[PDB]
């Protein structure tokens, strides 16, 4: 041979998959929502396409530990954010309950009378204070009584109201010595190699869903819907629905008016609900029957494609808890919930009834509810339907035209994976050698 | 046994008073409730009002409230009883309790420093067998 | 224009040459976002001194291998007799970065190892005996 | 509250048992549990004699001629083999938590 | 034309303003107060015995004082250094149960009160005396004149620990390698527009700041006259902080020797209160060296016409409003006394000066997390000096120039730490760049 | 002797050249005064800057260190690979600014010019000089 | 005369005592568990099995026994360990609560040290109030006058987190230290050393070898053993300010027991917070006992004694019986599973120059001689044995006012972490490298301007 | 051989000058790190916190040297000769004798008083000349 020796260039890129960690990046500019908490590094003002001309790589939808680390993120945040705020336990103390009258249905609104202990020590004070419907445990040897359901165990309140949250488009992005890759790649079966491949500096801006069922307020497929499963067989996956055109949703407030506090001591308050002006049943929201009718054909296609037939997939119900069933929403980051069922019936303008919950489970480990304060004033909310998370299982089959596929859902990870489905963060890395027949010049 | 004291028997005027003196021998009273009673001839019993030996006091029966008011000797363990206004449907014989009252209490509650809201002061313990007691007449 | 850790990404050894300076005046970050001042109150330190860990130890280690400071050169030490039978014009016209790099995974000891002996001390060896008059 | 005793006469033959009751209209326990129950005697000549029959207490010199029981608006004593030596007025006591008071009485007494 | 190459190599230092965080040094030693907490709490590394200083013969530079945005890093930094202080120490939340009391033994400002808390054991509620303050609580109707805490439905309620005293350490920066000290070096800098005898340097002085309102005290010294500086007097809205060239003497005392007792707040914890009086029960007030004030006013008052025209009298007494903005303060060994001033100035052109104490206190004058100061047994001597002052004119004044009446202010504590850096800059060094030189090209092949 | 640290802002461009030196010990001045921390967890507000100030330190004189190494220029003060440029930018002689001002002066506008800069910047990574450097081994 | 230049290759041996810090280099097997102490080692670096030891050859270096920083900042490493591992835990102000004590009962099929004890107490509703009911020591309770015998928590007035955290406490285990780059390890070596001054046989160590951050109140366990006879050293051994710290050359053979016994009824008090009762003890009730042959004892102490006398000036001074001190000091702990056993050391002590040492166990604990606040060890479900393990003794000493020097007691003392951990650290200190390749020498530069 | 800090301790220069460039391969040890810096993390404690801050200590450290040797126009040297006299730097002792008789602890002892000349003349006057000798090359 040739005195192939050794050289060792580097200065066109290597890479490996990313382990790192990735910081909260924004239009940053006081913090009152949770996502972004106090603090947030700048956004790049020039993110760049830049293409990788002859190169494909191998991406996966649901292998992405960045979206873990979101979610270790979003505990994190919520925590924080009320960490250093009041825990109340007093009010595991029961109730008296009667139905709210209002100017001139079942006991949906309760006025209760709390005996209130707080404040001085000789004194406790009964009072009243307006409740839902999803309300707290009733009392087994009393007449409509009630003590809390998130005591028990735990503590859960709005510990400082001025904090909350509504999602907010906040990005993220990698460390020195990081890049984000992304596929460009139009209709990815979501496994294996990716056509075009591009760069990304910091990743699009971010709205969390906290929900089931529909994805709202996100981004959309390109042309048609689209959609992905790990495993589109296997029927303990869930089949994620991204879609190429969204549906208005128009949300309406039960009242307008206010909330009130117990003083609990020097910077401690609580609040529940207040007077009520207006017909508090209106609470409902409006959407699009027609934009929604059209989406499900649309999505109905191309579950038939997907499984070679002109099949049937029926929206038979599913959940069997309110937290499941619904796509409740925090609107104000207070959680409405109307009825998804209506919504998407049992086939294959609406106008949804809604109702209020104040505790509500969190996606945290510790299997334990935020309270959502009460909001004064009166509630509007929209958005648009983005996509549909759907499940099909049971084996109640016995066609090849017979499908059984209904509103899903998983977990916040899973939500997020719809923007992290693009891309994948990967550590840069020097070369190795680029021999030849060269000699270096020595002189030794 | 501990004799129990009583004032002796009297007779007043119509709209008069009386004193009944309930010493109890050996001092017992000071670990004892004293609740006080009528019995007219022929007749049950009635309160007319409790007091315990730890000074918290009221009346019971709601017709005694300003003909009866009742008061002790802390030293010699003598409770007084003082009647007024009194009448010919007063006759009865009178007598104080024996026996005791324990402070129960059936709500609880504590806030989160210990401050105690809890309501007590229900249940009789023990049932009073009085000495003879003392007849209260009227006439003139 | 150069893409740096992109674009250059498909091309092969020779047509990669003219990037190698790219990625290079681009590596690790431009530092502005992170002197321009969650988990990240400790994190972003951790981040920044394994960034500078890793930035060190190539320029030390490029040391190990002979050169650092100025580009790369080359050693006596011949590719061929720790590799393959590919041929080096496959490499050098027919055949991207990556795929050969991917190649050198159970050949990236056999080197290492060479270059301590070799491109490092006994370098070094024939340095001292240069230095000597 | 209140508290009667029917039949509050009971004349009978010596030795025959006596069935005694109390009605108060009120739903009594003792708040923390078991019914408050309580019973005295008044013999002519005498002041009161307990008959207490609190579900396990008695007032001690109480005799097996006398047991009770009972919850919420009533309950009742039963004497057996009533003598001469138990004529007089007997009261049901009331519970206590309203606060309380005292019986109606009823009288027994050997039939001529 | 020769071929050139345009380059300096690294070392010629082009100045571009620094943003961020200083390098905090001290004169350190093992001291008792660096274990109590008492002002640096922590990280201050002992400091360069002969700092350095480099004149620029060519250099002068443009000075702003009011963007010596450095300050309120500092200022953000002894709030947070206090704050992780006072964590978890002494919570006095549970410590909000009434007082009853009518006076002690001029008016009861401290009285002598009954009250009942629990804790240190949930088996127990004690009933206990301790001496409070008028000015720290809210009286309460139909119980033997009963109180409430002042602070019992507001915020945080806390103390201050125990074990720390807050004399003022002068600690000082050297500022964070890559950085350096601009200082003007000069004497009548206006505090804007360029200063002339600019040089590099090291480190600067220790400050001694104390919480304080009208008053700065035991600060630096003018070099020869009175100094009266404002970022533009011209607006109503600009505060004028004055700097004097002679301090004059402050002097308080308790003026009594008082005793704590202790509070059993729970387990494990801080337990003090304030106590009874040894010897007579007396008024607080400091005795100032009012020749020397007086001399002061003469000199404040002058410079008060000098830099305002043909105007003629100025300066007069305060307007009112909480004791924050109307009495003189100081915390003595952490003993917050206001003083009425009004003796210094009541006119226009031996003093002393009654005293009381609060003990409640936000000592940032923001937070909110007001903390409750408790003495040491026996009495105190507050030692100190009058080094400057904070005035402002009202604009409400007629439209004569016979008058200009300016009245006693105050601020943030980082307003008054300008005073300091004033005199300098920070600066952030990169000596890398570029310049045209006729240049030989390296050819290889 | 030498004036001292930023000694260079108070003499002219030529002038400067003699603080290269001083400049490299401005780099290093501070690790110094830090190792007086580490002689007395430190997880508090002073703890952390005085950290953060290392790293971002080292950050910056890697940046700087890195561009040199770019060049080729590092190790050396004075490294020369000419680079004939766009001489738009500036009609003065040499000596009008080298031998007369203050390069403080000099510096007060040239990030005007920031992408010419930055182009010749590019240029002097051996773009071209690379290419020799390798013929030359192989042939 | 030749001219001058400056300048050698750095790497000559020359260094510079070392600010301190202490890598933490782990064993590799750390990773594998759920408890504390090991979980800071599972947070560390696992290192090479075989690492570089190399003799100075003609160097002494000092080395101090009794000084500088190396165990000082291991001993604030362990508490700021100890307080991240209990700050998560719960701790129960209303635990303080007085309770209605008993004696333990058992089937019928010692004193009354262990009793049932029960409280009405509100949970987590705050106005429910609960039975209480678990098993206490004596040791950890205070009895209440005029209140039939009930009883108080003990360390009631000081701050107590009342739980360890069940799955969190456990024993440390051995943890090699290394220096940061920039700094080495050396060693003495040295075999019978005598603590001050120049070490003759030192070497540069590429980290320590394993050191256990074990507690033990006085007798040294667990760690390493003397290379041929005791060594006995003190700073001065004639200063009677100063205690001597004794070494074995042979283990010593122990074996404690611990009864079986159960754990029982989380008891809520707050919202997800509860006291962990302490279950029934399972068969018979006794003691918790150490059993130790006299011979092993005797074999050192003998060896011991001699050689102080001869360390003394051939007197006549011996080991003998302690003056006692608080329960904790007067009784030589030890923990085991998380159990705290004390035993009476006056088995051997009552000795002038099978032996079963009773012991008491307690739930109510201060980590070491630490002072401030105090925390418990929740029950231990199981039985707990420990042994083999004595490999140093006790550090000892004695003072006397009197005008003879013929007798002399030595007695007990230490348990104190750093005391106990320097007594074998001492052998390695920290150094500072710095690469001073600097050298006057003859010959000039190549320059040709 | 490793002899330097690894045993050089026990010989003088005038012998240990024979090995002493082997510790060029004891920097292997840095890059040792780069596995030791393959632990995962997630919250640091007491020993995460502590190598963290040792890992920027030692890169000053680095630093400090690397960037004296380019200061001293002795980068990339195993020995770089910087023509600096002897000056005021000299102990009463010939640099013949002091290279026998060198051990290296207590040679470093004399430049304990003398080490500001060290820094101060090569750092001066080695720049001094080569900065004059490379701007007369860029001219010629
Ligand atoms: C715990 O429960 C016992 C139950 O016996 C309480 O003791 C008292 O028992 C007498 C018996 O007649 C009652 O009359 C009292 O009212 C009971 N006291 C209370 C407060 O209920 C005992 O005091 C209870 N202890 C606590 C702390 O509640
Ligand atoms: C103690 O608390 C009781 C609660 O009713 C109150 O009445 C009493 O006055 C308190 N004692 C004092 C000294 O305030």
Same mark, same amino acid.
């Given at each position: ?45 020039? %993110? ?70 707080? =404040? ?23 007449? /409509?009584?009630?003590?809390?359901? !998130?005591?028990?165990? =735990? ?37 294996? %190699? ?38 589109? /067989? ?26 009130? !506090? ?120 929209? =958005? ?61 | ?39 007219? /001839? ?99 | ?85 590919? =041929? ?46 | ?25 009120? !739903? ?34 109480? %005799? ?19 003598? !001469? ?28």
């Amino acid at each position: 041979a040739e005195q192939l020796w050794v050289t060792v260039y580097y200065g066109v890129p290597v890479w490996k998959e990313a382990t790192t960690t990735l910081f909260c990046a924004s239009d940053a500019r006081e913090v009152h929502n949770v996502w972004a908490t106090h603090a947030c590094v700048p956004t790049d003002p020039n %993110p760049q396409e830049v293409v990788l001309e002859n190169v494909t790589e191998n991406f996966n939808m649901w292998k992405n530990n960045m979206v873990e680390q979101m979610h270790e993120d979003i505990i994190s945040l919520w925590d924080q954010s009320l960490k250093p705020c009041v825990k109340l336990t007093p009010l595991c103390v029961t109730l008296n309950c009667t139905d709210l009258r209002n100017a001139t249905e079942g006991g949906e609104i309760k006025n209760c009378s709390f005996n209130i202990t707080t =404040s001085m020590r000789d004194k406790v004070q009964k009072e009243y204070a307006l409740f839902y419907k999803l309300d707290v445990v009733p009392i087994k040897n009393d007449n /409509t009584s009630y003590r809390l359901i !998130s005591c028990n165990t =735990s503590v859960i309140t709005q510990a400082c109201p001025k904090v909350s949250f509504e999602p907010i488009p906040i990005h993220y992005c990698a460390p020195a010595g990081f890049a984000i890759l992304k596929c460009n790649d139009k209709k990815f079966n979501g496994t294996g %190699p990716c056509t075009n491949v591009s760069t990304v500096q910091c990743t699009h801006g971010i709205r969390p869903v906290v929900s089931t069922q529909l994805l709202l307020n996100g981004s959309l497929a390109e042309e048609e819907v689209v959609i992905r499963s790990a495993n589109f /067989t296997d029927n303990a996956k869930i089949i994620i629905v991204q879609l190429n055109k969204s549906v208005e949703i128009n949300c309406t407030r039960p009242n307008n008016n206010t909330r009130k !506090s117990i003083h609990i001591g020097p910077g401690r308050a609580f609040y529940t609900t207040g007077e009520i002006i207006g017909d508090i049943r209106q609470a409902h929201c409006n959407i699009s029957g027609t934009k929604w009718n059209d989406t499900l054909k649309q999505i109905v296609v191309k579950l038939k494609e997907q499984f070679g037939n002109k099949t049937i997939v029926f929206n038979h119900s599913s959940g069997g808890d309110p937290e499941i069933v619904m796509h409740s929403f925090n609107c104000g980051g207070e959680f409405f919930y109307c009825n998804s069922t209506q919504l998407f019936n049992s086939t294959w303008t609406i106008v949804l009834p809604c109702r209020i919950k104040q505790i509500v489970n969190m996606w945290q480990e510790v299997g334990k509810a935020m309270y959502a304060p009460p909001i004064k004033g009166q509630i509007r909310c929209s =958005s648009n339907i983005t996509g549909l998370i759907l499940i099909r299982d049971g084996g109640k089959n016995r066609s090849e035209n017979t499908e059984i596929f209904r509103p899903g859902g998983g977990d916040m990870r899973d939500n997020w994976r719809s923007e992290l489905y693009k891309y994948k963060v990967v550590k840069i890395e020097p070369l190795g050698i680029a021999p030849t027949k060269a000699k270096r010049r020595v002189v030794q | 046994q501990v004799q129990l004291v009583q004032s002796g028997a009297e007779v007043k005027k119509p709209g008069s008073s009386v004193k009944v003196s309930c010493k109890a021998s050996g001092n017992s009273f000071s670990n004892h409730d004293v609740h006080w009673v009528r019995q007219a /001839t022929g007749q049950g019993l009635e309160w007319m009002g409790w007091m315990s030996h730890e000074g918290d006091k009221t009346g019971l029966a709601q017709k005694f409230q300003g003909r009866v008011t009742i008061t002790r000797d802390s030293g010699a363990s003598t409770v007084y009883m003082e009647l007024r206004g009194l009448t010919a449907d007063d006759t009865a014989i009178y007598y104080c309790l024996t026996g005791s009252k324990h402070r129960l209490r059936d709500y609880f509650l504590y806030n989160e420093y210990g401050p105690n809201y809890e309501e007590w002061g229900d249940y009789l313990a023990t049932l009073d067998v009085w000495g003879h007691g003392t007849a209260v007449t009227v006439s003139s | 224009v150069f893409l740096g850790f992109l674009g250059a990404a498909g091309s092969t050894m020779g047509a990669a040459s003219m990037t190698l300076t790219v990625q290079a005046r681009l590596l690790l970050s431009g530092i502005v976002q992170q002197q321009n001042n969650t988990v990240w109150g400790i994190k972003q330190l951790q981040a920044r001194v394994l960034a500078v860990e890793r930035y060190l130890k190539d320029q030390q280690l490029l040391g190990i291998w002979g050169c650092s400071g100025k580009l790369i050169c080359t050693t006596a030490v011949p590719w061929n007799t720790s590799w393959s039978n590919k =041929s080096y014009n496959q490499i050098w016209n027919n055949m991207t970065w990556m795929e050969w790099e991917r190649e050198i995974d159970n050949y990236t000891s056999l080197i290492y190892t060479l270059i301590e002996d070799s491109q490092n001390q006994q370098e070094k060896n024939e340095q001292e005996l240069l230095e000597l008059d | 509250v209140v508290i009667t005793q029917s039949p509050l006469f009971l004349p009978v033959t010596p030795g025959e048992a006596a069935s005694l009751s109390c009605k108060c209209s009120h !739903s009594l326990q003792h708040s923390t549990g078991a019914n408050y129950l309580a019973w005295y005697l008044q013999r002519p000549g005498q002041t009161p004699r307990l008959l207490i029959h609190l579900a396990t207490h008695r007032a001690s010199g109480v %005799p097996d001629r006398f047991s009770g029981s009972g919850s919420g608006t009533d309950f009742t004593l039963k004497i057996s083999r009533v003598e !001469s030596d138990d004529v007089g007025t007997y009261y049901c006591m009331q519970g206590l938590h309203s606060p309380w008071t005292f019986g109606q009485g009823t009288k027994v007494e050997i039939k001529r």
